[PDB]
Amino acid sequence: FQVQCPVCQQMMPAAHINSHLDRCL
Amino acid sequence: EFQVQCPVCQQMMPAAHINSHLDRCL
Ligand code: NA
Ligand code: NA
Ligand SMILES: [Zn+2]
Ligand SMILES: [Zn+2]
Incomplete structure (x- = not known):
C-alpha cells in the first residue's frame, strides 16, 4: 500500500x- | 526473473x- 511522506512528498x-x-531527517 | 529481498520491509x-x-x- 503506498503512503505519502509528510515531509518530502x-x-x-x-x-x-x-x-x-x-x-x- | 531473480528475486531479491527488500532490506527495509523484507x-x-x-x-x-x-x-x-x-x-x-531528497
Ligand atoms: Na516511491
Ligand atoms: Na535521523
Ligand atoms: Zn520523505
Ligand atoms: Zn521494501
Whole structure:
C-alpha cells in the first residue's frame, strides 16, 4: 500500500515510511 | 526473473524493480 511522506512528498510503501523519516531527517 | 529481498520491509520482488521500490532522501 503506498503512503505519502509528510515531509518530502514522495510516495512509498507504508512499510518504509518510518525508516525513511528516520534516515532522511 | 531473480528475486531479491527488500532490506527495509523484507518483501521479495524482482531485482529489476528493487531500485524503484526503495526511495532516496531528497
Ligand atoms: Na516511491
Ligand atoms: Na535521523
Ligand atoms: Zn520523505
Ligand atoms: Zn521494501
